[model samples]
Target: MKIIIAGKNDIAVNVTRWLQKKKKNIEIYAICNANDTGIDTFQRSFKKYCKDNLIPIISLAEAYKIDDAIFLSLEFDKIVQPSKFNHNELFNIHFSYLPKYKGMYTSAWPILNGEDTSGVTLHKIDHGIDTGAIIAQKEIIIQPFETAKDLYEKYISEGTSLVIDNISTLLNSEYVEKEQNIKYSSYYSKKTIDYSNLELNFSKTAFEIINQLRAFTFREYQLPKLDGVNIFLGDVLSSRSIMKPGSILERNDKEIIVSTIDYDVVLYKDNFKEILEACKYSDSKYIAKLIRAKSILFEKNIYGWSPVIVAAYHGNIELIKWLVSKGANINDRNYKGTTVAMYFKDYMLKSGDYSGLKMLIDLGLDLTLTDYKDYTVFDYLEKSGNKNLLQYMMAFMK
Candidate 1:
């Protein structure tokens, strides 16, 4: 029998690899989401994996007609109807334990609910959304300080293992299916949490408030805000409080402690501001320490400028090199779509330092990228009226 894997991200890619390794001649195909870019920030793209390995990609409707096939869905975006497929071997590895977290945003719901544990489940797919017979389940302990993104990565890891261990049961059709209890099931829709506009209310207990912060702490996408500033981390302090629930007890440069129902909570501002400040002054020594402290290396600040871009604006060649060595993407554009090379070009004109131009060449800056206004580096240089810097830059372009 053939196997059809339908999903996105790492779990789908890992399962496909495992199946290919075990069965030399196994017929495997993949079904990718419509919007799959074949590349992602975490570098685990199932679409790219299939294309590189020469695994054929088929449409979902085409997948429905494959008889006697074991269909597996790992983080697949769409819902499926069992009646559409004639085969009884369809299965899905959901991100959370069955009978709870049955719908959208599985990662954030658990953390927001302050759950001590979360799990992954392998179940037979039916007409209902994540309401199916369980084949296997694996529980994972949620660390005290784990964010939604951290818990999500763990789901991918543990879920891959869960599917690997249960592959034989699907291939042979040997496992018994147990119905999920209806009383324990809970579901959430897309409206459950709005990432674009999230507000933190201090009227709740310290635990609840901190859980809200942790649930929304996905730095790659968004962060909870405090008085128009982004808050990246939080902790529930042991000290008791008597002030109004929303009143600020104390605040400093690094953090702010606010009163809550049960205890005080400390919220730490996002360190992207500090990293940009360090870049502005050419403080590579402090940047090394900040990187060690888990500061997001490539995050853009309010001005839509990243650390590398800011450093390039000041002609900090050493700092830019160090950031690149630590995996900062130099080609990343700010919200205005401006690149580091463009900023450096402007810097070289003002500082009259053609010496660092060679360093930009060594870093392999993309000279063709344009800003939001469709102005390329060549355009900026043409209007700068600095014939020497323009002539110096044009030398390497040739």
Candidate 2:
């Protein structure tokens, strides 16, 4: 079988070596822009591998005559002409889950957005960049201090293996292709110098700052300044520190003090740095999406329910009422399954705010949605000994 590999970079060289090692009846073809110095280096390395393996290398101008092609590490700077290959012969590997992070610098964007995971997808190439049917994918975790360089290293290494293993699946029809969901699709462009700057604000917690730091640590980008000095507020390694926002205060060589707007914590910075740096890039997305989901609640009040929850937690009844009018979900739960109503109920019962209880009842919170531990909001209200809330709930029942 004839196979063409069109890409120039470390990824292409690795893929070439992997194919040559298989020693099957496969003929290889390669394509790279002649002007790129990186491509020139890549070709030299590949030529050595080809010389040792006794494989034939063909140029892109001569690649159309080949039967199958796999594109790796090719930028979207130019369009790939379809006439360059036969039907079902063109393919490429993208370093994202697809339908999200579709354009260049995908690795940087996820990090910039503070994602926790990332993955690679090999797909059929079409007229557009990275908008193709996927054949295979593998996700990686993004460590706390990981930069785009770290992600690229991991993906290129493991991605080569996945490409070699699945190439035949594409050829033999063992794999399936599905159209990308455009509604959920997101794309990113190449990172610019401006993207490297980090902004530190009082509104942002230390965890967010740390996440942003680790995400771009290896890239050309630098962390944003705190009063013109790079703030070295140190690491986050455990779930404990993440519970509250703005927890970091000071750091020694080994440990750091963290405090939320309301709570405080102390943790080791060294232990956390490795876990943060060692995690795969793909896994960062899961964490990033969770953050995004929460931001959507806090900022846009997208569901109009989060502000009420926030207000109630802060004992601000006026904010709660305003949020209700804006359509906050009195019954809505965060990703952790904590409801806004329960928070309000806990505070109101503590402060003896019977009027708060009456307002919650009027707003239609059922007080029955069980949390992750299966404890109902009513159970907590009852445990807090708020007779007024119970009476108000009874009134609603009637």
Candidate 3:
């Protein structure tokens, strides 16, 4: 079999090496991006491997004629033209279960959106972005403490096995390829400055705050901040001197205790000395429950929704009414500086569902409060050109 593998990272390099080691009478072609910082290393390693094994490395244009073309982490920046290759022979590996996440940075969006599970899908390539027919998919749970980088590593590790197992059956027969359901599909862009700068409020639980920390933590991305400093749990330190959440611990050289609206957290390092010190201070009986709750919430994929925002997003009139009846604060602001009304406005605008907007107004949501972006719910409604919603709000105002 003739195979062309195009990718530009450690994952790609690893996958290519795995295929070569199989010794399955396959002629392998490798393509790495020209400007990648890892390009030189990848090229050197690939060249050495190819020289030893007598395989050829070709440019993408020439490799397109191969019997099979596989894309690992190639981002050509623009839409891949359908005319460029034999449609049946082209396939790409996407990091998320498709139809849900269909664009770049799949793992990061799910984390930011507070999703609990994420996985990989290998699909036939077509004109649309990640909209091709699926070949195979595998889902995995996202760890509460998993960062985007962590998820990326997980997918790359498991995804290799999924691709190798499914590729033969996929290429040999005329399997039915289903188009992605546009209704169910959502796209997310790469993380932006605004997304990184969101602030967490005290209304959020310790778990919610930790999810944000784990999801976005990376050398390139800093944790979400309030007043310009990264938020850390300062109270309880672990065996490694890492702070546990809700502890009224003080800042030591290893970890620091910080304040939250409800509780405290301990931050510690993984070093042995720090670990021993944290272990000495550890109250496993009480801390265990808190950690377990955080884990369960992560597994369930619960989003960080204030009670009001959850009700409004679902457009559950009874739930919204009930929560309000129980003294749920509709105007309560989240870390993003958005009140429930603002969140509802954004959700309604995205989904074109005016019912939530009507319910919020009817329930007497405060439209005057500005969001983190300094825009009020009324401003969002006006900018969205939702005339029916406007009429509903105007009626409720009277």
Candidate 4:
């Protein structure tokens, strides 16, 4: 029995090659390449794959003229009327579990909607889009971490077998066409989705956010935004909310503590790596987590100052030395000429941290670094009337 495969993009290419290699050796009449605007740039070159398999291309009119051939729709646009075929016989691979989802972006929808299972259905094509008699089906689990691309690949792979296993039954006219139960089905059109449609609301449950994460995370698309910039979420198995809803908790060097009404989601880095060497202070750990799967001790912040500078401004001697041990540059500064050491003593003088200041000075921080105001860091400590602190740095002033 001969068949006509009408589709475009990657799914079309997948079925084209599969039909040729199957042991049943189904006769392929020709391919009906449906030209549509949404075809991806990468998969636009399927005509070459079609030629490599020696499957000649034909128009829809040519396909209609083949009165007795079976018509198969992989992802063809422009629905065909039922009367044009010999026995109302057209088949299609709907990239979803039939009697459920029956329209566009089936792969992405299940992930977005948080369905636990997805499948491929080979069914008789009727007057409606995927509202036909089911011939065969293969269901697969949607793993918690799967992406849209992941599900699309599953459609192509499973759809191949779904067709190959049922080709003989259709040819022999020996199989029953099971009607779809429309009560369980829903139709979604292509117009419903936009790239910006995935913008995240921190007020959503951690569970909902997790689903949105898997569904929307693609290198090609903008990552789901929080407040304004981008954020990456981790799995929600152990994450739950503790904070009041909509509170975006502080992202520590090692954790992104995001809160929902029911779940406080804590996330670390994925398998990411450092893209740029230095970033703003608040962005440092996030960028570091993305790149190296670990928090950075000293990434620059929005003010263009490193963690050491921030630690210094807080008069936290331990934070300064912790940062220094990991290579926090002593001389790093914000756009102004203010240095971490300059900020440190300026803060320590009033914060009443005499030993912390001395410990920091013992760490060999150059006391002579001046700020945009041209005041040396140690010069203030001497003049602040703190005689002991001034005496400690007096060794260097001499």
lDDT tens string, model 4, 1-398? 67787877656765665666663466675554545443224243355555656777777777877866778777777677777766666888889898888888887788878799989998888888889999888898998766665677678778867776776676667767889985878878878677656666667777777777666655344445654545444645355656676675766654466778677765543322233232213343443344432223433334555556766776656656655665667666664457876776666566666466556666767777775445776666667777776675566442
Deviation of model 2 at 339, angstroms: 54
Worst 10 residues of 3 by lDDT: 293-302
Q: What TM-score does model 4 achieve against the real structure?
A: 0.60
lDDT of 2: 0.57
Instruction: Tell me the lDDT of candidate 1.
Output: 0.82
Error of 1 at 389 (Å): 37
In model 3, the runs with Cα more than 4 Å from the true position are: 38-55, 65-79, 174-176, 191-205, 219-250, 259-398
lDDT of model 2 at residue 211?
Answer: 51
Evaluated at residue 247, the lDDT of candidate 4 is: 72
TM-score of each: 0.70, 0.51, 0.54, 0.60
RMSD of each: 8.9, 19.8, 21.8, 19.8
Prediction 3 global C-alpha lDDT:
0.56
lDDT score at residue 342, model 2, on the 0-100 scale: 70
lDDT of each: 0.82, 0.57, 0.56, 0.65
Compare candidates 2 and 3 on TM-score and give the better one.
3
Residues 327-350, model 2: lDDT tens digits: 556666643356876776667666
lDDT of 3 by residue, 66-151 (tens): 55544433332345555777645667778888778888776567886789998888777887888888777899798666676568
Stretches of candidate 4 off by over 4 Å are 9-11, 22-45, 227-233, 237-244, 252-255, 266-398
Q: Candidate 2 — which residues are off by over 4 angstroms?
A: 33-59, 65-78, 191-203, 219-233, 236-398
Of the two candidates 1 and 4, the one with more favorable TM-score, higher being better, is: 1
Report the C-alpha displacement of residue 309, candidate 3, in angstroms.
47
TM-score of 3: 0.54
Prediction 1 TM-score vs. true? 0.70
